[PDB]
């Protein structure tokens, strides 16, 4: 499972 | 130098990282929860008020340089920026690129972001538009 | 699933008599009759939701109320019923109601 909270530039 | 910074630099600085996007991935746990949400905060134009001071009781009034010196206050003005808030969501079909779509949630509004000290006799200062007689009235030395 | 309360109404009671009378004659299967009742609720429910617009109100004094299995049951005595115009006097009125939100 992913981090369920990702920031994209 | 200060006039240039207040007039142009402040807008430029905000326009560098004005956009923040938070990605909420699909988090595949069940077929009933397969929507991916995207929340974005965008900073618009910045606004600067005249010098002012906030007191303990919560009353805010214009502050003049003479009053600031006596009360050990700070001669500063407020900074406000228009913030545009949007959110996009899409159906996360497995093994395919997503197409984020506006979900009819777009709100707009000024948000305080701190106080900028104002140099005396600047474009934003109260004494720039004051004549010789006006300066005498405000107890300031020409 | 749809509630079976409608079978107690005049239309429902008439259907039961019609189907049961044919059952005694042996021209209709008992299981087949049940299928008709299941479809009776669907058609009755469908038309009621879309093909009615009248409104009536009743005012009176409650004599007995009850609730169980998401089915309310009130009994209003000496009440006046008005439709859309003309009031109707009822000595004893029994109320049977089911949950508006269908239980799937």
């Amino acid at each position: 499972l992913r981090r369920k909270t990702r920031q994209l530039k | 130098s200060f006039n240039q910074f207040v007039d142009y630099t402040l807008q430029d600085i905000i326009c560098e990282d004005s956009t923040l996007i938070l990605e909420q991935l699909a988090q595949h746990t069940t077929e009933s929860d397969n929507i991916s949400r995207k929340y974005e905060i965008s900073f618009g134009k910045i606004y600067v008020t005249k010098p002012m001071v906030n007191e303990s009781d919560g009353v805010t009034h214009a502050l003049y340089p003479q009053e600031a010196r006596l009360r050990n206050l700070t001669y500063s003005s407020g900074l406000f920026v228009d913030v545009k808030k949007r959110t996009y969501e899409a159906i996360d079909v497995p093994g395919r690129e997503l197409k984020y779509e506006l979900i009819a949630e777009e709100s707009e509004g000024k948000v305080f972001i701190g106080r900028l000290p104002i140099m005396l006799r600047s474009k934003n200062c109260y004494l720039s538009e004051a004549t010789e007689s006006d300066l005498y009235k405000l107890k300031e030395c020409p | 699933g749809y509630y079976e309360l409608y079978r107690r109404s005049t239309i429902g009671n008439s259907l039961v008599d019609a189907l049961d009378t044919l059952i005694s004659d042996g021209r209709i299967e008992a299981s087949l009759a049940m299928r008709v009742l299941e479809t009776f609720d669907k058609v009755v429910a469908e038309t009621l939701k879309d093909n009615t617009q009248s409104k009536l109100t009743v005012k009176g004094n409650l004599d007995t109320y009850g609730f169980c299995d998401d089915v309310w049951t009130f009994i209003v005595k000496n009440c006046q019923v008005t439709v859309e115009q003309s009031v109707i006097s009822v000595d004893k009125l029994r109320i049977v109601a089911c949950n508006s939100k269908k239980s799937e």
Binding site: - | - | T64, G66, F67, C68
Partner: protein, 181 residues
């Protein structure tokens, strides 16, 4: 001293039966019952002659409320047990104890709530932005009194007639000292 006897408005009493009851059976066999296990784990029952409400639990515990008198509450509780007995379940009257009595009265003059909250800062608790009535927590007897600007006093917490009367007598002198204007 006061010259006006407070009028009881609500009596909360707890009774036990000592036997297990089937709420659904009572609900289906009782004229006025409301059993909704989804929301609450008891069947609500009411009767007309005493104008009282009863909460019947599956453990044989009963909570009678709305009775305006102790003798009336006893009659209502007996009737509530009789109704259960008439259904078929084994229900017998047992210890009947009252856990709270509510009374009301009026002094017929305004009160300066600010003064009361200042002088008697310990007993009083004035929060006008939440409730427009001051809260008084009497220490002896231990009874809570609600005092309003309009001169209406609500007494709650007393378990007997003597206690409620004593509280009202003990609060009148202090109450009169803070009359507005």
């Amino acid at each position: 001293t006061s010259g006006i006897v407070p009028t009881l408005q609500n009596i909360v009493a707890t009774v036990t039966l000592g036997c297990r009851l089937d709420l659904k059976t009572v609900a289906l066999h009782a004229r006025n019952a409301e059993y909704n296990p989804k929301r609450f784990a008891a069947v609500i029952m009411r009767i007309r002659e005493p104008k009282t409400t009863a909460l019947i639990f599956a453990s044989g515990k009963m909570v009678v409320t709305g009775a305006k008198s102790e003798d009336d509450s006893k009659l209502a509780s007996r009737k509530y047990a009789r109704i259960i007995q008439k259904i078929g379940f084994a229900a017998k009257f047992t210890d009947f104890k009252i856990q709270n009595i509510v009374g009301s009265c009026d002094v017929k003059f305004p009160i300066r709530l600010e003064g009361l909250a200042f002088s008697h800062g310990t007993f009083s608790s004035y929060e006008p932005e939440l409730f427009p009535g001051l809260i008084y927590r009497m220490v002896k007897p231990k009874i809570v009194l609600l005092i309003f600007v309009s001169g209406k006093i609500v007494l709650t917490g007393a378990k007997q007639r003597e206690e409620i009367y004593q509280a009202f007598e003990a609060i009148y002198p202090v109450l009169s000292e803070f009359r507005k204007m």
